[PDB]
Structure formats: structure tokens, C-alpha cells
Structure 1
Amino acid sequence: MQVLHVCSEMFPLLKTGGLADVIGALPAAQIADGVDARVLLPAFPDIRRGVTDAQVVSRRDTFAGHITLLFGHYNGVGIYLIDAPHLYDRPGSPYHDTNLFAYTDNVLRFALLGWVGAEMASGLDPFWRPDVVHAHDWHAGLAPAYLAARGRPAKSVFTVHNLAYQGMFYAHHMNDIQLPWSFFNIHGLEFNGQISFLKAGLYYADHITAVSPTYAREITEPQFAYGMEGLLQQRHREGRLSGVLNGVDEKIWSPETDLLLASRYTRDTLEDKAENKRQLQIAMGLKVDDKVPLFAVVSRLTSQKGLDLVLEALPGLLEQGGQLALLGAGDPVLQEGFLAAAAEYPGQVGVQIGYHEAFSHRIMGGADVILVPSRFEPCGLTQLYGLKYGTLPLVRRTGGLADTVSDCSLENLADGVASGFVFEDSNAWSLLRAIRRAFVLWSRPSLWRFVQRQAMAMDFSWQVAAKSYRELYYRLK
């Protein structure tokens, strides 16, 4: 069974969110579980420089100009790179320019990604051909469309990591992407009078996967599907929609071996976590104090994440004696809101705006609680990292958060299953009740430790997840 993943990022070469973590870890797990998995990425500069053994496979002309298909390895997995400097050799984000505006040729940049994924099924590489093309998110959404147009020389799965990003382009671009004009149809890639790469992925794939069992249910609802729900309801009925939960990469997110930490620690030696908290407090300019709970955020700052609710709730949190440490980047309103809070409450609120990979580990390893009050959350990895690090997640019951965190209710505590704090509604009052629950648990240190050890006993394994994907691939044939 040979599978090609088609996507736009991969940890540690290029990362803007959880997708990169998935692509950095899933393929190696699949290989251990008996599927020959390879990855296809655009040759963005950070990616191209990471793959040092890359060699030329072939040159092709394309609706978007010439490519050199390269192939090399990273961490033992086979990586194909689409080297097309006129599209991909640009500094910064792969998705937008430095003024945060989408590149005007994005339609071509990402249409090409899907085209190469499909061409691989037809022998673009004379020595290797995938049985299944596994496309991820809108960026790779045309891969199943190009496959369909060619008579489906391989099977395809499309996985949604986030349905809010639709890959919308003006209809006239049908002229530019070398797909049959008949594809521009509601029974096709058309959506609200435009081309949607997301729609294309959802429509043309043999099978759709979402990144948690409950998100897969949620996206059949208007509230989470933003117009796509009719298609997804139909595919559900056809047995062509399922959920497979992400794992966590233990090479990188384990307090037991984490080299980025002041002090490594384990489920049975949580006293060794204390030094990380002390150093985190110092680093953030917070009062150094082990008697007080330190809440944390490591997050993109967009409305998805419900961090406006944290701002609303902050005074109540501080009033009860807590501290906040936030690391994040995104909406300037949020950035300034949090910067203003750090200014207003020095020694109680520490804030760092920007993307800092190493610092996220130091937060995860030192904080007592990780706040993930999401409006929607296809899976969420930060809460999984919190569980593994014994930093209790406080989450809204939605998407993967609902699948992975067990509230500290009476039953869950009595059954030995409690692992964090859960609230229901997207408002600050509902958040504040879960925050109070945390303060109550904090006042009972031995119960807190009991819950920490349960959180750290939870397992989210890529090789287990790989087993589910493998069943899917063989079923498709």
C-alpha cells in the first residue's frame, strides 16, 4: 500500500499550526504500521533547505509554468518537493506576503500542488506511484479534482483539518487551472458563485476524513460547516465521511525527554516540574510563587480560539489569585488587548506576541493549566500537549476537545477518569465557572495531583491512528 500525502507544511521544516505537527509525525507512524507513506510539499525556502539529499526526479511544463520535481528524505521519510521558484521561492509565510495580504497568484500556487499530487498517480515519478492520494485542507483540495478529471488512476482521501478556510477564488480562474469547465457546478467545485478548493476536496474525494470523531459529526451541521453541510450530510449517508483523531509526536512533546525544558520530569516525579514554573515566572516577569496557579495560552489569535473570552474573564481570574502567561500571534485587536493587560497587571500577566517554538515548550512545561476556550476546534493539539505535560487543560466542549478531555465532575473523579476542566457555552460566565472549578481543585493539592497523573496517563498515538487510516486505504483498494 503506497500513499502520498499532499499538503503545504511539515514540522520542523515549516509550521504555522497543528497541520505541520501532523504531517511531521503521521507518515513515519504509517510506515511502522505497514504502509509506504511519502509526502508532497511545495519547495518553500525553509522546506527546500531542510531536505539536503534531494535529487531530481523530473521536469514538467504545467498550466502554472515549469516544475522540477525533487525527491529526498527527512527523518527517514520520503519527501517530494515541487521546485518552482517563480511560485514558491518567496520569504515569510507560504500563504501571504509581508503586509499579510494573500499572494495574488495563490490560485496557481495551490492548484499546482494538487495537480502534482494527481500526476504522481500517473507516473510523474517513474519509480514510485501511490495507490492512494491523501490530500490535506483546502491547499491540496484540487488533487481529487485532477484525479477525477483523469478517470481516477488512484483513490483519494481528503482530510479536513479546518473547515473555516475555504480556498475561495473567482470563477474566471477556471481558465487558468486546466480543469474541465463542467466542474464549475454545485455538483462540483462551485460554491457561492466562486471556485472553492475546499469544496473541490470534499466533493471529488473517494472518502472524507476529519481530524476528530466529533468534528466529523459537527461539520454535518450548518453551525460548523458554513454552507458545506448539505454535501457533508450526503457523504455521511454514503458512508464516505469519518473521524480519525490526531496523535502527538512523542519525540518532541514529552516532558520525560524534552531538551527545551529547564527540568525534565515524569508522571511519577511531578515535583521536578516546579523548577520549570519558577523559571517561567521569572521569564514572564511574574511574581515567583508556587502557591498560586499559573494559567497559560499558546495559540493563534483568531476568533476560532475564543481568546476574547479569556480577556473578559481575566479580572475574575486575577481576583481569585491566578497568573496568566500568554504566547500568541494574530488579530491585532487581540494582540493589543493582551499587551494592554500585561501593562495593566505587571507581575500577574505576562505576554509575548509572536511565534516562538522553543518558548511554547517552556510554557507547556511550567504552567499549571492550559486554556483552550475554543469556539470550534477540529482537534486541538495544545490540549493534548497539556495532558501529556500534566498541565491541566481547560476547554470548551466542542470538536476534539470534547473527545479528549474529561471534566473533573464527581463521576469522573470517582471513576479515576477526570483529566481537566470543561465548560459548555462560548461566553465569559461559562468560562469563569470552569476557572472557579480549577481554583477549587487547586485548594486540594492531592486531588490536583490525582488529576495530573490521569491526564498524563492518556495516550494519543500516531501508530494507533495509522491503523485507522490503513483500514480506510485498503477498503478503498
Structure 2
Amino acid sequence: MNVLSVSSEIYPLIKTGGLADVVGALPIALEAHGVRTRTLIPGYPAVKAAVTDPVKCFEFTDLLGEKADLLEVQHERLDLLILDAPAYYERSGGPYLGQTGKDYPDNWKRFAALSLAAARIGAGVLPGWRPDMVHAHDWQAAMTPVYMRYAETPEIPSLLTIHNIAFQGQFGANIFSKLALPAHAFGMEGIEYYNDVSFLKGGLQTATALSTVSPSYAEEILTAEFGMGLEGVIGSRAHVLHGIVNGIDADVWNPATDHLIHDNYSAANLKNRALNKKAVAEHFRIDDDGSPLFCVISRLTWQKGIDLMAEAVDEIVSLGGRLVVLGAGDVALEGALLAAASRHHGRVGVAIGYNEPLSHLMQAGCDAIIIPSRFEPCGLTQLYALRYGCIPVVARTGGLADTVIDANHAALASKAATGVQFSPVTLDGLKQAIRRTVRYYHDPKLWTQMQKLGMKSDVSWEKSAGLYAALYSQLIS
């Protein structure tokens, strides 16, 4: 089938967050499922300067009053469509921020334009190619279904995926008369949101189907705690809301071939992980022994529950375990971690900063990874852990709740357990999860069993793509 994907960013061309990763991986992965995807992206300078032999295939005479050429090319493995609209995208730096660090006051118009261009493509303006449906990502592209709904042409199906529910494209009502929309589009069925204009809300109301990056996060956004004000709008359309876990690049993250760790291994050869365990203790300059080695690889923030992790160091040490932390974030948390390490020489190591290679080595040598997040749309670290045989100990939140099979009595009896989940996300709950993990560590047969099961988990983008393709099929009915 033919799908028009719409986004303000895409890896490897331009990226400011995970949004670009999903947008850049899913298309490629989807091909293995009989789906062709062409992703419409803005013609940022950086974007134009990486492509080769763009081929002007269309020319928009009026995009909210500006001209734009539609370029088509093939970059790394993406079938692209670049909206070359100098008036909107030919600027110094940052896709959304100006050289000073503030959003271009011009954003609403720059991305509504992207969306209108996509809706027109959805209407069949391009000779030779007309999508079967549109897949819009985040607010910058959420207006696509809005424009198609109000356009004269009957709309094709659309899937709007939420990556960052905190960025809603909320603007003053004074931009409405510049959006080329009918007056009734500013009603409740449309883009009005508390007397203001909301691009994301608009899209949430008009897309044929809605989705976010994990089944649990899709439930969480229906509640005031995670909805950020759109829970009402989303709840009213729950019947067409879906959750699909993100995949990971299993070729880059493969213990058997990874060049960034000390010694390779697979489920059929765990013995070698011990060599990575040694390397990890040495790197962090802590004792190197057979005790439980726990790690944390994350943003050091309240949202990731690191305030809880900080108060759980003594628990780990008292149980006889060690802890190594790699990450950056809130200065107070960075500081409390370094301070906890300062009174636990030889048992706790903390590295404040960024270090992709060390991150790989940690998944390869640590016995377990603790991820006490309060907020996690999907999560990547638990997937790498499963892949590397590092037992994930996680909070039941968002994707962490959907990706780990808790070692309860029933899963232990059927040998289906892959890790430890704890709920509620409180210090006590975290401490209990930690004690559980230590007990399991001291049961070798069980531990290796969980590692091996974990390592066979299909966490590839191809697996996710399948779920997406399935949804696309139902959408095109």
C-alpha cells in the first residue's frame, strides 16, 4: 500500500528528539511488510544539503500565501518528498527555535503549511502518486487531517501518532484567519481549544485513528496525570486509539556483533558476559567481584524517578550489591548521586555525562538495570537490556509496563518471566523490587533462564512495523 508520512523531522537528516528516530526507522521497517512510504518533510537547509539529485516534481503556487517546490529524492533508505518553501524553512538553525533560542513566532504558519501541502498530496494533486492514507506525527503535522476534513475533496484515511503530548501547537486565536480554513473549523469539533488554536487538538479530532508509542501510554493519556489537558478530547475518541511499542535497531544493538563492548556473546553463550562485568567494574573503578551489579542508564530527573533511585543506593549496598550510574539531568539529582557514591567507595560508581560506548558496555556487563520512571511513553533501555541479557527491574509505567514479563509465581512456573516490575512508583516499591532481584540473582538456574528468554525477545522495528501495517490495512478498510 501507499502511505504518505508527514513529519517536521527525520533521522538521519534532522533530529531534536525521539520523534525523528521513529519517523526515520518505521518507513524502512515497513517495506518488509509490503508498504511503501514517502515522508513529506520541510526543506530545512540541513535537509537540502545532504540529499543528491532532488527532482522537482511539483510546484505549489499558494501555501498560505507562499510558493514552494516539491522535491523528491532517495536519501539513506527513505523515499522522501521535500517541501522547498524558502519563506518558511530557509533559516539559520534549529527547526523550531531561532538563533536566540526562542520559537520562530512564525511556527504555526510554517507547519500549517507543511500540513496543507500534505493534505493536498492526500487529495491527489501529484500526478503519478496518490497515497492510500496519511500517517501524521506530532503537532507540526497534526493539521493534515484538519485540512483534509475541511477541504472540498473527501479525505483519505489518516493516523495521527502522538510522540510528545506536551507540544500541542497552541497559538492565539488571531492566527485563525490566516489558516485558510472555514469559520466552523474553529468550533469544538475543530481546532478551538480554550479560545485558542491547537494544531494537535485539531488533529486529534479529525484523524481517522489515533495512536501513541505503547499500549499503556495510550491508556495513561486518557487520565489527567498524563493527558496534559487533551485527555478529554482523546477519551472521547478512545475507540479509535491505539498503542504500539517502538522497536529498536537490533543490528546496532546485538551482543553477538557489538563492537562497543568488551566481549561478544549470545543466549547460547552467556559465559562471556562475565568479561564485560569485569570491564564495567574497572571502568567505574569499583570492586570487581561476583556480587549483583546493578546499573542505571538514564536522564537524571524526577520524571525518570531518579529522586527515588538516589534514596535506594543504601538498600542495594546493604543487600551486598553494587551500582554504576551513567547519565545527566537535574543538577540536584546528579549531585545526590555523586554524593551517594562518595560514601560508598568500591561499591558505587557514578559517571555524569553522555557516553554511548559505555552505555553499550553497561548493558553487556551489568546483571540488572533499574528503570523507576514515573513517565515513559515507551522506553529504549529496557529493550536493550532484554536484548543483552541484562535483567530489567522497572516501574509499571507506560512502555516499561508492556515490555517486561514480571517474575510472579505464575510466570516463574511456566518459565515465561523476563524481569521485575514494581507498582506503585514509590521508594518502598523500588526497594522491594531491588530485594526481589537480589533473591533471584542468588538462584542461578532461574537467573540465566530469564536472561535467555529475554534475549530471544523480538524487539526489532520490523516487529512493530507489522502492527502498524496491520492498522494501516484496517484504516484503508
Q: TM-score scaled by structure 2?
A: 0.88
Change beyond 3 A, Cα 1:117–1:312? farther
Change beyond 3 A, Cα 1:327–1:113? farther
Conservation of the 8 A alpha-carbon contact between 1:278 and 1:288: no
Residue in structure 1 matched with residue 137 of structure 2 by the alignment = 136
Conservation of the 8 A alpha-carbon contact between 2:57 and 2:71: yes
Q: Note if 1:185 corresponds to 2:159.
A: no
Conservation of the 8 A alpha-carbon contact between 2:8 and 2:42: yes
Residue in structure 1 matched with residue 227 of structure 2 by the alignment = 225
Please give the secondary structure, in 1, of the residue aligned with 2:263. Answer: coil
Conservation of the 8 A alpha-carbon contact between 1:64 and 1:108: no
Residue in structure 1 matched with residue 267 of structure 2 by the alignment = 267
Change beyond 3 A, Cα 1:297–1:72? farther
Tell me, in whole angstroms, the C-alpha distance in 1 between the residues paired with 2:12 and 2:272. 27
Please give the secondary structure, in 1, of the residue aligned with 2:253. Answer: coil
Q: Note if 1:375 corresponds to 2:377.
A: no
Tell me, in whole angstroms, the C-alpha distance in 1 between the residues paired with 2:179 and 2:112. 6
Residue in structure 1 matched with residue 458 of structure 2 by the alignment = 459
Residue in structure 1 matched with residue 426 of structure 2 by the alignment = 427
- Spell out, residue by residue over 1:386-407, the C-alpha distance to the aligned partner (whole angstroms, 9 max, x if none): 1111111121112222221112
**Identity across aligned pairs (percent)?**
42
The Cα shift of 1:412 comes to: 1.5
* Structure 2 gap segments, 5+ residues each: none
Counterpart residue type for residue 56 of structure 1? K
Change beyond 3 A, Cα 1:251–1:229? same
Residue in structure 2 matched with residue 81 of structure 1 by the alignment = 82
Tell me, in whole angstroms, the C-alpha distance in 1 between the residues paired with 2:244 and 2:221. 14
Residues 62-461 of structure 1 mapped to structure 2, 5 A cutoff: 62-63=63-64, 65-84=66-85, 87-88=88-89, 94-96=95-97, 101-123=102-124, 125-150=126-151, 151-236=153-238, 239-283=239-283, 285-338=284-337, 341=340, 348-354=348-354, 356-461=355-460
Please give the secondary structure, in 1, of the residue aligned with 2:400. Answer: helix
Please give the secondary structure, in 1, of the residue aligned with 2:268. Answer: coil
- Spell out, residue by residue over 1:144-199, the C-alpha distance to the aligned partner (whole angstroms, 9 max, x if none): 11221214442211112343433322222324433334322332222233222221
Counterpart residue type for residue 33 of structure 1? H
Change beyond 3 A, Cα 1:95–1:460? same
Counterpart residue type for residue 122 of structure 2? A
Tell me, in whole angstroms, the C-alpha distance in 2 between the residues paired with 1:383 and 1:98. 36
Please give the secondary structure, in 1, of the residue aligned with 2:399. Answer: helix
Conservation of the 8 A alpha-carbon contact between 1:220 and 1:230: yes
Counterpart residue type for residue 379 of structure 1? C
Tell me, in whole angstroms, the C-alpha distance in 1 between the residues paired with 2:45 and 2:338. 32
Tell me, in whole angstroms, the C-alpha distance in 1 between the residues paired with 2:278 and 2:122. 53
The Cα shift of 1:114 comes to: 2.2
Please give the secondary structure, in 1, of the residue aligned with 2:123. Answer: coil
Tell me, in whole angstroms, the C-alpha distance in 1 between the residues paired with 2:282 and 2:21. 29
Conservation of the 8 A alpha-carbon contact between 1:341 and 1:349: no
* Structure 1 gap segments, 5+ residues each: none
Change beyond 3 A, Cα 1:311–1:132? same
Please give the secondary structure, in 2, of the residue aligned with 1:63. Answer: coil
Conservation of the 8 A alpha-carbon contact between 1:6 and 1:133: yes
Counterpart residue type for residue 439 of structure 1? V
**RMSD of aligned Cα (Å):** 2.9
Moved more, 376-385 or 325-334: 325-334
The Cα shift of 1:14 comes to: 4.0
- Spell out, residue by residue over 1:65-99, the C-alpha distance to the aligned partner (whole angstroms, 9 max, x if none): 44443322234330223344565466775444577
Please give the secondary structure, in 2, of the residue aligned with 1:268. Answer: helix
Residue in structure 2 matched with residue 33 of structure 1 by the alignment = 33
Change beyond 3 A, Cα 1:40–1:415? same
The Cα shift of 1:329 comes to: 4.4
Tell me, in whole angstroms, the C-alpha distance in 2 between the residues paired with 1:177 and 1:114. 11
Larger radius of gyration: 2
Counterpart residue type for residue 208 of structure 2? D
Change beyond 3 A, Cα 1:89–1:419? farther
The Cα shift of 1:209 comes to: 1.9
- Spell out, residue by residue over 1:29-66, the C-alpha distance to the aligned partner (whole angstroms, 9 max, x if none): 22121111122223445544543454333443533744
